[PDB]
Design a protein around this ligand. Structure first.
Ligand SMILES: c1ccc(CNCc2ccc3c(c2)OCO3)nc1
Ligand SMILES: c1ccc(CNCc2ccc3c(c2)OCO3)nc1
Ligand SMILES: *[C@@H]1O[C@H](CO)[C@@H](O)[C@H](O)[C@H]1NC(C)=O
Length: 352
């Protein structure tokens, strides 16, 4: 079990003004620290944030959060977690609805606070008095909206630790299921409410509503008004300096949802699905640390059975171990693992 701590700086809040926080299980014999960012979509105007508050309130508030069990990469049992079972474990709940990008407080002009980027900074700060000052590696991990949050925030955590006087701690990222394409959709709707708004248009509006922040080098490339581009992995990744390992299902269910596809198959859709896998594979060609199986799924790293899937005979925990060794090719220890077969479940190890 990981134990809840609410932030001592109570100006750093969830959407409704309640304090943000983190869950922690220390391993005092270890100098490795895993900070995991939870996912769960986003909201981008008053009307859709109000709805989310009624039926997804744990993603907007800490009022109803004392312990949580660590699973997958957050498990302390080597049977479930062959990679980092002895590490210090931190789960950061997603209560800002902003893809971890926001820097805006609730105020006379703002019904909600969007503080995701500041929540990450404050967690790192408070952890530095609880053992993180002695770390050798800080791995910032996350799933779905939390995976995109890794891409947006990993270089900011690295800069923070350097400016606080800890330049020797190695900061790295692990982004799971947060590598999306701004691709052509299977069917199209003009952006008129929540359901009809494609991600490019919803994120453009969100950035303005949240006062969202993107990494500096990416921001300098795309410039004012085009920051939405930095929420797309293939565009932001080449601007990052920290090492980042990318986990992405080739036929991700959230990607298919935003593409207006429902699987529940004739030539047009067959060609669309095969083209999506081909395009995703293409964007990972020059990503040296990656794991991308040919499956229809969403998320993996905190699932208890995350050990089961394999690409070219190598599991995800093994690939992450090989990544560690590479940061000290390697015979029998690969780090770039992308499937090449063209249809969901052409890999027999895909989840059922
Ligand atoms: C501690 C602190 C705050 C709360 C929430 N209380 C209801 C509420 C008030 C104002 C709001 C809001 C919700 O959403 C945006 O503005 N609970 C426990
Ligand atoms: C659990 C389930 C579903 C989700 C949705 N992921 C958010 C998202 C979607 C499209 C995006 C994006 C972020 O940034 C680029 O385009 N998260 C967690
Ligand atoms: C509390 O958090 C706010 C928001 O980032 C920051 O401006 C302020 O300096 C923090 N105060 C302390 C004492 O850490």
């Amino acid at each position: 079990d990981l134990r809840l701590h609410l932030l001592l700086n109570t100006s750093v809040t969830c959407n409704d003004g309640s304090p943000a926080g983190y869950y922690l299980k220390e391993s005092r014999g270890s100098r490795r620290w895993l900070l995991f960012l939870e996912g769960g979509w986003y909201c981008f105007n008053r009307e859709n944030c109000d709805s989310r508050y009624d039926t997804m309130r744990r993603l907007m508030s800490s009022r109803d959060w004392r312990t949580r069990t660590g699973t997958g990469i957050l498990s302390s049992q080597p049977e479930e977690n062959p990679y980092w079972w002895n590490a210090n474990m931190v789960f950061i709940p997603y209560c800002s609805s902003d893809v971890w990008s926001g820097a805006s407080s609730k105020s006379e002009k703002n019904e909600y606070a969007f503080m995701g980027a500041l929540i990450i900074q404050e967690v790192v700060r408070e952890l530095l008095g609880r053992g993180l000052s002695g770390a050798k590696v800080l791995l910032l991990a996350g799933s779905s909206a939390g995976g995109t949050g890794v891409l947006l925030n990993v270089d900011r955590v690295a800069e923070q630790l350097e400016k606080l006087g800890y330049p020797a701690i190695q900061v790295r990222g692990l982004a799971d299921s947060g590598w999306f394409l701004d691709n052509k959709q299977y069917r199209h709707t003009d952006c008129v409410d929540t359901i009809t708004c494609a991600p490019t248009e919803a994120i453009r509006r969100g950035i303005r509503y949240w006062n969202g922040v993107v990494p500096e080098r990416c921001r300098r490339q795309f410039q004012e008004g085009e920051e939405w581009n930095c929420f797309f992995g293939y565009k932001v990744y080449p601007t990052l300096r920290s090492p980042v390992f990318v986990v992405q299902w080739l036929f991700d269910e959230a990607q298919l949802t935003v593409d207006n596809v429902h699987l529940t198959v004739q030539e047009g859709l067959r060609l669309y699905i095969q083209n999506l896998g081909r395009e995703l594979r293409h964007t990972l060609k020059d990503v040296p640390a990656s794991f991308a199986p040919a499956c229809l799924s969403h998320e993996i790293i905190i699932r208890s059975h995350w050990t089961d899937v394999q690409v070219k005979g190598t599991s995800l925990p093994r690939a992450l171990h090989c990544w560690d060794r590479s940061l000290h090719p390697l015979k029998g220890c690969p780090v770039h693992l992308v499937d090449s077969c063209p249809w969901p479940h052409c890999n027999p190890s895909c989840p059922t």
